[PDB]
Design a protein around this motif. Structure first.
Motif, PDB file in Angstrom:
ATOM      1  N   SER A 247      -1.177  -0.060 -14.492  1.00 59.22           N
ATOM      2  CA  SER A 247      -2.236   0.131 -14.338  1.00 59.22           C
ATOM      3  C   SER A 247      -2.097   1.448 -16.168  1.00 59.22           C
TER       4      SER A 247
ATOM      5  N   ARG B 288      -5.871   9.686  -2.412  1.00 59.93           N
ATOM      6  CA  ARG B 288      -5.547  10.619  -3.539  1.00 59.93           C
ATOM      7  C   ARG B 288      -5.363  12.217  -3.183  1.00 59.93           C
TER       8      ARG B 288
ATOM      9  N   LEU C  99      -8.189  -2.934  -9.057  1.00 58.42           N
ATOM     10  CA  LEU C  99      -8.323  -1.995  -8.033  1.00 58.42           C
ATOM     11  C   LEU C  99      -9.054  -2.398  -7.117  1.00 58.42           C
TER      12      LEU C  99
ATOM     13  N   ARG D 224      -3.276   4.521   1.913  1.00 59.75           N
ATOM     14  CA  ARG D 224      -3.334   5.306   0.974  1.00 59.75           C
ATOM     15  C   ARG D 224      -4.155   6.293   0.284  1.00 59.75           C
TER      16      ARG D 224
ATOM     17  N   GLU E  99      -0.579   4.389 -13.616  1.00 64.00           N
ATOM     18  CA  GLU E  99       0.028   3.567 -11.700  1.00 64.00           C
ATOM     19  C   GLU E  99       1.603   3.018 -12.206  1.00 64.00           C
TER      20      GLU E  99
ATOM     21  N   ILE F 223       2.602   2.228  -4.744  1.00 61.90           N
ATOM     22  CA  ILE F 223       1.801   2.563  -5.894  1.00 61.90           C
ATOM     23  C   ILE F 223       1.531   4.290  -6.220  1.00 61.90           C
ATOM     24  N   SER F 224       2.193   4.708  -6.819  1.00 59.17           N
ATOM     25  CA  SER F 224       1.982   5.828  -6.925  1.00 59.17           C
ATOM     26  C   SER F 224       0.797   5.962  -8.809  1.00 59.17           C
ATOM     27  N   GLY F 225       0.134   6.899  -8.042  1.00 54.08           N
ATOM     28  CA  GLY F 225      -0.688   7.189  -9.688  1.00 54.08           C
ATOM     29  C   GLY F 225      -0.356   8.458  -9.811  1.00 54.08           C
TER      30      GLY F 225
ATOM     31  N   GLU G 156      -2.766  10.100  -6.943  1.00 54.90           N
ATOM     32  CA  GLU G 156      -2.954   9.019  -5.513  1.00 54.90           C
ATOM     33  C   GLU G 156      -1.434   8.208  -4.902  1.00 54.90           C
ATOM     34  N   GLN G 157      -1.430   8.079  -3.979  1.00 56.59           N
ATOM     35  CA  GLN G 157      -0.503   7.084  -3.428  1.00 56.59           C
ATOM     36  C   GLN G 157      -0.874   6.509  -2.210  1.00 56.59           C
TER      37      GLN G 157
ATOM     38  N   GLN H  11       3.745   0.776  -9.846  1.00 62.70           N
ATOM     39  CA  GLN H  11       4.472   0.706  -8.817  1.00 62.70           C
ATOM     40  C   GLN H  11       6.291  -0.003  -8.016  1.00 62.70           C
TER      41      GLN H  11
END
Lengths: 284, 295
Positions: free
Chosen positions: B115, B244, B160, B242, B126, B142-144, B91-92, B128
């Protein structure tokens, strides 16, 4: 115009630097994709041999260079890049480097329709000479004097037979947008309004990019994956290329490590690089 | 296994620097040709709005940045041990507070794990990143990261945002971009030198037929379509994005961006590989300043 004062004017001395990223950016700019030139972890990762031609533009900067980058010297719009010579004494350090450049006008000849001005650049590392460049500029309309300079090498004559080898490369319509990031930010190659003002319906590709494309073909055909074998190259720029066109490199093996060549736009049958002479180290 | 420890791990502070040339290199890296982004003397020359995603890779380097960059390799206390084999960039999110100075700039980056969730089938971490200068905040990222398998614990993190529901109706707008087979060779020059995107042997090593294109480059391609359709030539209108990453893209493939206007300055979107009909960027939400608010 006093040519004696031009040719006795002292050389200019400067510093040029390049890092590994610069080498990669150059390789992609000339459309090379072989991991030898595009991947820093390749077993044979090298600078592309023609790279030093960019250093008088880039100099010491890691940023955008504003364009443009002697004594008895007399209109910039009248100047054409007509000829280029590149002699490689030693390959560049592919991990990056700093070089000393020494540059001087070596010829100022009255060709009648204009002036041939030859500007020499010699690059040295800490050890000594690594590259010698000669750029031939034609200044349209500048005449009426006794010209002087170096003994000019023979004009290359392309053999009257079919090429021994051919290569083709389809350039991207956005090739100039990528190539300019190696040092030459001249608006002629990117801004359609500037191109239109000097007689072109679209921006033209840098002549030195075309030279890089031909260099890629010569390296691939003759140098057997070894950059140390790429010794020298000289060309005349004969007509413009537009980004998006296909550049054909025609190659004539002449023996003794000498290859004569042309680059031609496939779509138009226009010769863009003429009188090409390439020297490489013969089979090891 | 200690989530409280992970979320309490102190923030890291670093510096990021870019010049004009870096902006041009990024623009060509994501395949943009518009003079607004590729020509420094364009009258509206601007950084491409997604560029901040590169800064955690780049830091202050002007050279090749060996992967992984020091600014991203640091594991929080106390993290498990498993190698980057079961990890993926899932995710981004990018939120733009102020557009970047197009003449170059230096920013303070502040990064923190916010997270650590148990997804049942894996772990979502996550991370940040907040960028700021002397005049205040400029961007929030925020990178997931997804760690498949790592489960069985109590998860904690930030509240979230709502899950993006892609509308079932026909897309309102479509765009496509044919990527170059050598697109990753150019895109990597903006900071991500991961061998996964260039070395076929490393790619074949982990199951792929050939190297894959950077997920963030695909995100750039979608962002280009969104800017072109909605932002009216003004980077200040590009507010947030944002996504995924749902499946891989191969350099040379055609990326289609499907766009759904939802009103109130919100656009939902997907990016799809045309040749395979595979969604590569899913659950896309784009927020822009509306036409009636363009001063």
């Amino acid at each position: 115009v006093n040519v004696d004062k031009i040719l006795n004017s002292p050389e200019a001395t400067y510093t040029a630097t390049y890092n590994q990223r610069d080498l990669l950016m150059y390789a992609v700019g000339i459309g090379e994709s072989d991991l030898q030139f595009t991947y820093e972890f390749d077993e044979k990762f090298s600078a592309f041999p023609l790279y030093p031609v960019c250093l008088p533009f880039k100099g010491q900067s890691q940023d955008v260079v504003p364009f443009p980058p002697p004594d008895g010297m007399p209109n910039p719009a009248m100047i054409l890049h007509g000829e280029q010579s590149v002699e490689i004494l030693r390959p560049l350090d592919p991990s990056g480097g700093t070089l000393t450049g020494k540059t001087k006008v070596i010829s100022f000849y009255d060709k009648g329709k204009g002036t041939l001005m030859e500007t020499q650049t010699q690059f040295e590392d800490g050890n000594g000479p690594v590259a010698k460049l000669i750029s031939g500029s034609f200044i349209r309309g500048l005449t009426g004097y006794e010209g002087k300079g170096r003994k000019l090498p023979a004009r290359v004559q392309i053999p009257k037979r079919q090429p021994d080898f051919n290569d083709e490369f389809k350039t991207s319509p956005h090739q100039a947008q990528v190539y300019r990031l190696s040092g030459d930010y001249n608006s002629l190659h990117i801004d359609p309004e500037i191109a239109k003002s000097v007689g072109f319906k679209q921006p033209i590709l840098h002549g030195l990019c075309s030279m890089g494309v031909a260099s890629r073909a010569l390296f691939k055909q003759f140098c057997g994956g070894d950059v140390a074998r790429f010794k020298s190259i000289r060309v005349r720029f004969s007509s413009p290329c537009f980004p998006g066109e296909t550049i054909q490199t025609r190659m004539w093996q002449e023996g003794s490590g000498k290859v004569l060549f042309q680059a031609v736009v496939k779509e138009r049958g226009a010769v863009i690089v003429d009188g090409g002479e390439f020297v490489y180290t013969q089979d090891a």
